[PDB]
From a paper:
[name] forms heterodimers with retinoid X receptor (RXR) to bind to the promoters of its target genes. The transcriptional activity of [name] is enhanced by co-activators, such as [name] ([name]) and transcriptional mediator/intermediary factor 2 (TIF2), and repressed by co-repressors, such as nuclear receptor corepressor (NCoR) and silencing mediator for retinoid or thyroid hormone receptors (SMRT).
Similarly, we determined the crystal structure of the hPXR [name] in complex with the agonist [name] and the co-activator peptide [name] (CPSSHSSLTERHKILHRLLQEGSPS) at a resolution of 2.66 Å. The complex exhibits a homodimer in the asymmetric unit, as observed in a number of previously reported hPXR [name] structures, with the dimer interface being formed by the β1′-strands from each monomer. Protein chains A and B are similar in structure, sharing a root mean square deviation of 0.727 Å over all atoms. [name] resides in the highly hydrophobic ligand-binding site, with no hydrogen bond having been clearly observed. The t-butyl group makes hydrophobic contacts with W299, which interacts with most, if not all, of the ligands co-crystallized to date. The triazole group is fastened in place by a narrow channel that is ~8–9 Å wide and is formed by S247, Q285, H407 and L411, which reflects the plasticity of the hPXR [name] in molding to the shape of the ligand and may contribute to the favorable positioning of key protein–ligand interactions.
Numbering used by the authors:
A (entry chain C), D (entry chain D): 682 to 696
B (entry chain A): 142 to 177, 211 to 229, 238 to 308, 319 to 381, 385 to 432
C (entry chain B): 139 to 177, 207 to 310, 316 to 429
């Protein structure tokens, strides 16, 4: 849910 | 003086700030501009363009803020203690501090003499508005780089943001950053209440955030201006 | 006094005034899609007032050698081209000009384009502020040595005479129907028309301007035309030089040069 | 014969 509603943040965090 | 551990913490934070804060805004490019604060743009060749707004800059501000926040995300990502946290806490901490960390970074390029933020080839010029008072008050304290970066850490590792699972660990980290800041001040600076003045500014900044988010949500419903990344930050859909 | 003009003179002034109204948009409302400098004695700053109240301002570079000393020329070319299309239209609605063979029409317009633009631009020049007010655009001079440059002196001198619209329009007619431009076949007809426009101007001034501040006004006007014919020569020469190095002219300007 | 070297003028004059 939290990662689902923040896809871009999540992406920027994973790189 | 400071413990070896305190010295390593300041060093890690100072290195993260160096790697992720382009103070010349050299890589801020392709932003929106109001079509043909006041805004000044100096070209490499000597030309100056100037925008005076009416007695619509928001697309541009959104682009600026978004650039700032990408830098903040990187800053956070370079910090060991933040990397160790579970991903959802990383997100919740960044959602909660984004505004505050941008403002603190922007304070370092604010010139109190001329009321101007000097962002490389860009400048924004224009104080009962709390946001402007904050910049004047914070600038008057004349903080060092290391104090700024510890303020950023203390704002980032706040245990009480909406959605944090590792509340206890985060509270522990916040306090070590605060103790290091208290020590840094003891060992280098009379300035007898500087640490508490710093904490009062964080609190004030936490309150401007509330007000400003409310205002930006209202504007965004009528006239959408926010980037995708901002929309995520605001819980906009 | 006012009606001391022949019927024929009155109709000439009316035709010209009406041509000027139909073809000179003083608000520049339809001047659009022009080039803008991207994000030395005739250096101007440029101001753009948005419909909404906001202002954009360009201050141009200082002289640091070159490659940027002409930053504004694409824009000036676009402005000049818009001006000249208005001048072509002005000419086209004049009966005497229509009657002329097409080659003379071209040769007269080639020869007067610069002069007619300048005269039109003088009417929106504010001598107080050293600014041409072109609708939502303004061109301002930077900072008495500006009076060295003949083009600037011309604007200041011409403005000090405080001419009426009718005088400006007769000046335009006199400049347009010059018999001695490079390439005119109907030299004799054109010389006849020039002189009737000059006589009407002389009469217009006799019948409307009794005061000592306008002593010799007609002859002052004719000397200004002559000076303007000479600045044109100088300015064309400069623009040709610049254009060879850094091409900036529109297709319509290239034709005119 | 100036009409070939001044196509745009010629055009504007015919309108
Ligand atoms: C949740 O993340 C954010 C929230 C924000 O506003 C609440 C902002 N934000 N803060 N200020 C703005 S703003 O209204 O465009 C703005 C930007 C800059 C200035 C200055 C230069 C200080 C005059 C004033 C106001 C925004 C957008 C930025 C981020 C990243
Ligand atoms: C024959 O056709 C032309 C010839 C011109 O210059 C000789 C010009 N012209 N005159 N001045 C210019 S310019 O150098 O771009 C220019 C135009 C206007 C001004 C102002 C700011 C009004 C003083 C300064 C400089 C041009 C181009 C225009 C036309 C249409």
């Amino acid at each position: 849910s939290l990662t689902e509603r923040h896809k871009i943040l999540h992406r920027l965090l994973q790189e | 003086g400071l413990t070896e551990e305190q010295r390593m913490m300041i060093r890690e934070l100072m290195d993260a700030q160096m790697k992720t804060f382009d103070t010349t805004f050299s890589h801020f490019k392709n932003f929106r501009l109001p079509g043909v604060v006041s805004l000044q743009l100096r070209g490499e060749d000597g030309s100056v363009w100037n925008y005076k707004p009416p007695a619509s800059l928001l697309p541009h501000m959104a682009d600026m803020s978004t650039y700032m926040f990408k830098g903040i995300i990187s800053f956070a990502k370079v910090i060991s203690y933040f990397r160790d946290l579970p991903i959802e806490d990383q997100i919740s901490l960044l959602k909660g501090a984004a505004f505050e960390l941008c403002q603190l970074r922007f304070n370092t390029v604010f010139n109190a003499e001329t009321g101007t933020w000097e962002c490389g080839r860009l400048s924004y010029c224009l104080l009962l508005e709390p946001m402007l008072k904050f910049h004047y008050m914070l600038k008057k304290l004349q903080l060092h780089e290391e104090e700024y970066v510890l303020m950023q850490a203390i704002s980032l590792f706040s245990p009480d943001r909406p959605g944090v699972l590792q509340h206890r660990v985060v509270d522990q980290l916040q306090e070590q950053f605060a103790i290091t800041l208290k020590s840094y001040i003891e060992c280098n600076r009379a300035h007898r209440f500087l640490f508490l003045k710093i904490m009062a500014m964080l609190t004030e900044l936490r309150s401007i955030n509330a007000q400003h988010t409310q205002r930006l949500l209202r504007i965004q419903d009528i006239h959408p201006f926010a980037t995708p990344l901002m929309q995520e930050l605001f819980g906009i859909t």
